[model samples]
Target chain A: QTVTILLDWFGLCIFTVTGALVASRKEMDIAGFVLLGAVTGVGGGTIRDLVLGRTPVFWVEEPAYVLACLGVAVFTFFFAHIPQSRYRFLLWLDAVGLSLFAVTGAERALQTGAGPVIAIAMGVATATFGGILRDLLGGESPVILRREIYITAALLGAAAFVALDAFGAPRELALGAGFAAAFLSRAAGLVWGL
Target chain B: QTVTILLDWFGLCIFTVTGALVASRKEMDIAGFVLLGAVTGVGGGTIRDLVLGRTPVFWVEEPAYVLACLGVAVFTFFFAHIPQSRYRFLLWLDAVGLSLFAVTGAERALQTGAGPVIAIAMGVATATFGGILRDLLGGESPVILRREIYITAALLGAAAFVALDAFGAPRELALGAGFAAAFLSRAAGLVWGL
Candidate 1:
């Protein structure tokens, strides 16, 4: 349980950075950076919770998430300009976040008693919604519309975890396998720009 | 409930038109128009329902909203060329949508038994969220970030509705007064470019 939370935070942190980077390219102010960062970090989970009717929103219940997003936004504000291939780097970072979130999102939905379809949808949503919003707000086409392995990677990860769990696989094994599936697929996109 | 649903749909239809107009300006495909228009129309209400834990999401339960957005998109795709002042027309149209949503949102929240402040927030949310989303995806900064009467008008309408309700005013009077307030405020922005 502790490990899962840790893993989630790591994914969240990367997602936040990507959001800040997108905002930095535009003529946005510091407030915009924080807002975009926070949304990109917590937007998916917020949507999931809202759709599932979970109240208080996840970040509101825990101030840590807000602070974490702010910290990453501040970091990116100073450093976002230096990276030669900043957009590419952010995409790679998103792959890591996607893998972790894909597993955690599905498991959380399942725990909340969602059906198979809803759980898988939640999984993919948790992994991708934030990035999609970030792109939209940053004036870019969402990744799903692009001819890439992005959405496919998330689907594979979520399906792997859910299928394995349904067949009585251990939680650890299912999560690990899910993470690897997403990472492998996403990494392929990074390599071939698929 | 009938009045509430009608008011909400009125707001949604206007938002949908604004979204379609934005898409027509861009070189987006038909799918993009539908998705963008649909999101702009129902996005605010969906967020509100999700945060308040309302189920089936209004659009998820009924496909009417989707159809409405798609229909508007098709209309805009064919007829977008005639409007010489397309951008200004959209802003005016948005004001109408925003005014209606502001009142309906607060009323819905109050009926659901939320506090005055939260209810007012829901009103502003329903009024502005879809437009914010529209601007974001259209490669423009959200209207709230601009030096305009946009957010202020919604806030005024929401506050008027909630405060009137709190003081035991009748619904009809409160809604009419609130709608007038938002429209007048927003119309000033349209005329003066504030």
Candidate 2:
């Protein structure tokens, strides 16, 4: 329960930073920052929930997520140097959050009785959508479709979780181990710059 | 009642055609045509429904809409020259569909007890989201922000419907009046450019 809930809050906080940084780089105003931040922060979760027939999307169900994004957006607007100076930190945080989101998102889908394929798809959707929305809105090609090891990390995460589950591992262990694999793979990509 | 149901099917078919034409113009593969066409055809309504907490989106509840889009996508893929030659017809059809979608979306939001502002936003979302998704996925900037009558037409249509309904007008009459306003406005934009 802690991991599930913690991932929600932790992922939102980190993703909000990533999103707000992009809005700042684009010179967007307050409204742009808030909108882009909230969108990116919740985009993946929203897509996963909506397509899986989960009603009243998570952020809509909880306004605090949006308020958090708003605060982060405002904070980013004030800290102009964050995008250029702390970008590497931001990327690391995003990668970690994405891995968490993938595992948690897959777990939620399975809890909802979704098939393995859909659960895996949900994992990928949760990991990729926020940044994808940010890029599209910010006039950049979404990085997922670019020549990178991004979406693959999400895929591996989802596959690992399901694989562990199929082997009758503890739920927490499946989540932790799967997420670790994704984090390591993505972290490698970031470190190696490919 | 008859007109309302007919409008749904009519609007989807036309919007599907519009979507497929764009995909063909981009020289996308079969999967591209199908995915883009369905996204454009149902994109706005899906967003409106999801945000308004309308569960089990239209295409999900009834697969016919997607099938129609699939047919249109396949048809467009086979016809390489149709984009340039018959795009005018697509524009007019898209306008009519947009008008219908705007009114329907507003009505749905209001049905779910959303306030005026939310209702109007839903209306505009339903009318414009498909094209926005289409353009974004096709690697083009969304045309909605290009000083066009597109979103404005949806805004007017939604407002007119809500206003008329509030004034105790007949539902059919309100729908007719609102839709006419949107269609005429968008048509004028098409004829006059922007």
Q: Looking at model 1 chain A, report the run of 10 residues with the lowest lDDT sum.
A: A26-35
Candidate 1: where are CA atoms >4 Å away? B1-46, B52-128, B133-194
Error of 1 at B146 (Å): 8.0
Candidate 2, residue A50: how far the Cα is off, in Å: 2.7
lDDT of 1 by residue, A58-85 (tens): 6645557767987898888888889957
User: lDDT of all the models against the reference?
Assistant: 0.80, 0.77
Clashing pairs in 2: none
lDDT (Cα, tens digit) per residue for candidate 1, span B1-194: 47767878878887887888888877788787788889899998987787666777899999988898889877777877888577887888888888889888888877875666566666777867778888878876666554456656777888898888788988887888888899998898678873
True interface contacts reproduced by each model, as a fraction? 0.18, 0.21
What is candidate 2's lDDT per residue for A20-52, written digit by digit as tens? 777666655564566567777878888888788
Residue B51 lDDT (model 1): 69
Maximum-DockQ candidate: 2
